[PDB]
């Protein structure tokens, strides 16, 4: 199934697409190896979207989120500036 | 010093009354002081409850305490006070360290190999040191002799904190009171998921003291600890649990082989103490930083541990 993996980076969009191709290059061969692209539409592999910037120094200070009984690790980004962008396909 | 004298004047038993039978006129003031003491130790005023505090030193007894030395690793200092501890019989001559078990640590001793599980594995996350703490667990529940090596020592009342070599002080026999010279009353905290009220299972003579029973049994899943509460006697409650153990006699019928005497024995019960039958059990909630579990709260406990009487 799909996943919604997040990425923090201090690099440009033009660099983030290539470096995510490099990072996901095991998974491209993985998806090509466990299913075979018989139709045209399954050749695509994911997409990204820039969501906004923050100061690279004091960003992503870790914290914790507690529900009634459990606690999962959560990340916390301060002084955000939301700038949404469109979905650039990664393959 | 003057505070110490004015306080030691208060904690002071009264002088005994005198009768001067020899002289005559002194007998008048003797019986006058007698009726003066009686009429203000009987009538409805504050002088009545004043005489209830001198205690006349069969009414009140100081309790005994059980001083034991454990490792801090087998103990969780975040627990509430009245936790029923289970000392394990040590085979070494000069050991000094004894394997005590809070019911949470007892629960993770139970289930490891086979919410109470959530709270138990959240306070006692490591199972290595505590399964290592006993010498043997699987064969000792296979030979059905684990009951005689588990002895109860009653609830904790004062735990002195320690980085290592932890010391616990528990009331083994008698009225459960706190140990601090400023007085407090220790509420016995027993988790509800191993607790039951037997009158809620039975569905009439008003007793003096309703007892608290622990019945370790040898279930086919593994060890199971149950904190029974009943209105009845020891020779009575073994018959009540004989009626309750209806699938247990079916399991005993299930084992065709008689020479294997493991599966003919089904656990033992122990009378831990006697609490107030009128001031009944309350449900409370002992909290941890992750969760909060329902815990049966008993107040005014008079502990006297009984032996493991075999069902």
């Amino acid at each position: 199934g799909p996943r919604f993996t997040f990425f923090q980076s201090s690099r440009g969009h033009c660099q983030i697409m290539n470096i995510l191709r490099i990072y996901y290059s095991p998974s491209i061969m993985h998806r090509y190896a466990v299913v075979q692209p018989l139709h045209i539409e399954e050749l695509t592999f994911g997409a990204v979207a820039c969501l906004g910037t923050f100061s690279a120094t004091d960003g992503w200070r870790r914290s914790a989120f507690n529900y009634r009984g459990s606690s999962l690790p959560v990340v916390e980004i301060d002084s955000f500036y939301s700038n949404v962008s469109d979905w650039e396909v990664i393959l | 010093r003057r505070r110490l004298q004015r306080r030691i004047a208060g904690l002071l038993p009264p002088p005994a009354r005198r009768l001067n039978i020899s002289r005559g006129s002194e007998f008048t003031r003797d019986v006058r002081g007698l009726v003066e003491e009686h009429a203000q130790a009987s009538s409805l005023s504050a002088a009545a409850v004043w005489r209830a505090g001198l205690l006349a030193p069969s009414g009140w007894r100081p309790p005994v305490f059980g001083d034991f030395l454990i490792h801090a690793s087998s103990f969780n200092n975040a627990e509430a006070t009245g936790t029923p501890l289970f000392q394990f019989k040590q085979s070494d001559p000069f050991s000094g360290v004894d394997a005590v078990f809070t019911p949470l640590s007892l629960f993770i001793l139970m289930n490891h190999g086979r919410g109470l599980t959530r709270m138990a594995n959240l306070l006692y996350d490591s199972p290595a040191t505590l399964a290592d703490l006993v010498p043997d667990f699987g064969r000792l529940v296979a030979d059905r002799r684990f009951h005689n090596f588990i002895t109860p020592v009653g609830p904790l009342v004062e735990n002195i904190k320690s980085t290592y070599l932890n010391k616990i002080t528990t009331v083994v026999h008698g009225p459960v009171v706190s140990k601090a010279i400023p007085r407090s009353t220790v509420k016995v905290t027993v988790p509800q998921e191993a607790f039951v009220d037997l009158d809620a299972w039975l569905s009439q003579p008003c007793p003096a003291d309703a007892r608290l029973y622990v019945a370790l049994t040898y279930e086919e899943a593994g060890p199971r600890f149950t904190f029974f509460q009943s209105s009845r006697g020891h020779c009575q409650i073994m018959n009540i649990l004989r009626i309750y153990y209806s699938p247990s006699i079916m399991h005993r019928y299930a084992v065709v082989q008689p020479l294997h005497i493991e599966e003919l024995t089904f656990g033992a019960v122990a009378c831990l103490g006697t609490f107030s039958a009128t001031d009944g059990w309350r449900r409370s909630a002992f909290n941890y930083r992750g969760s909060s579990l329902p815990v049966v709260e008993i107040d005014s406990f008079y502990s006297n541990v009984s032996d493991w009487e075999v069902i």
Binding site: - | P205, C206, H234, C235, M238, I243, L259, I261, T265, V310
Partner: protein, 289 residues
């Protein structure tokens, strides 16, 4: 600790009832509660021992071991006073009981339901329509034989029996009341004894049969008189085997724990320890053991 309940009567006590109560002062009476004032309706063993139903004394044993115990000190008009019995307190109990069992041995006594007939201890109040029955007080060696006679009439109802019915005491022989059907809890106790016997019939050793064989053929004790020089073939056919030590020791360990279970199963009713029983005053300073 002024442990002094006042059992107030609903109606005025008559004079013959006053003499009947005042004749029996200091006898064992069970209470339903322990609270500061009780009522006659709820007092005594009459709520579980009625004229309506079968006398089932095993539930009365269990009620007695459950409920608190008391002795009677004062009976006046319209009221009677009881004194509770707590552990740690020594009480004076007078032997004012119509089945005369003398406590000359000064052993542990036993509180027992009136199996020996209702009519001697059916002490009557016609103020309120209530029938207080006093539980019988007897020593332990007579308690074990009355309990075995209660458990034996139920098994010998199917198959002389005056020896089974009447008690065997060294001074006198009193006849007790025997119901034909024991009841629910007496049959439950005999069923528990039956399942204990059917399970532990195979958990018996095999050298004891060689002992009883060699002792009946070789050295007749006084204690071997019950067989009258007779051995079945079951003794030989569990003596066809060789005797060992380890499985016999393990069988004996589970035998000791099962006979402890049998002991606390037969130990019914509260047991009181006597101390310096006075025969002349007919009272005994006792605490609850």
């Amino acid at each position: 600790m002024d442990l002094k309940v006042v059992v107030s009567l609903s109606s005025r006590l008559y004079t013959d009832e006053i003499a009947k109560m005042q004749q029996r002062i200091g006898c064992i009476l069970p209470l339903a509660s322990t609270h500061g004032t009780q009522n006659v309706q709820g007092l005594g063993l009459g709520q579980v021992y009625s004229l309506e139903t079968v006398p089932d004394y095993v539930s009365m044993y269990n009620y007695l071991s459950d409920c608190t115990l008391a002795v009677l000190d004062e009976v006046s008009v319209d009221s009677l006073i009881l004194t509770k019995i707590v552990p740690g307190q020594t009480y004076a109990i007078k032997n004012k009981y119509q089945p005369f069992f003398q406590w000359h041995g000064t052993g542990s006594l036993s509180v027992m339901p009136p199996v020996f007939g209702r009519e001697h201890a059916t002490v009557k109040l016609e103020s309120n329509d209530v029938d207080i029955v006093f539980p019988m007080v007897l020593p332990t060696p007579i308690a074990e034989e009355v309990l075995q006679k209660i458990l034996l009439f139920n098994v010998y109802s199917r198959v002389v029996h005056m020896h089974l019915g009447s008690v065997s005491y060294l001074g006198h022989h009193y006849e007790l009341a025997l119901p034909e059907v024991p009841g629910p809890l007496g049959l439950a106790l005999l069923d528990n004894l039956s399942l204990y016997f059917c399970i532990m019939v195979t958990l018996l050793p095999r050298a004891s049969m060689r002992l009883v064989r060699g002792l009946i053929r070789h050295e007749h004790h006084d204690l071997l008189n019950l067989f009258q020089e007779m051995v079945p073939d079951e003794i030989a056919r569990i003596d066809l085997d060789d005797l060992s030590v380890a499985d016999d020791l393990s069988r004996m360990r589970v035998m000791m724990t099962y006979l402890q279970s049998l002991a606390s199963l037969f130990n019914l009713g509260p047991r009181l320890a006597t101390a310096a029983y006075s025969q002349e005053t007919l009272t005994a300073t006792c605490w609850l053991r």
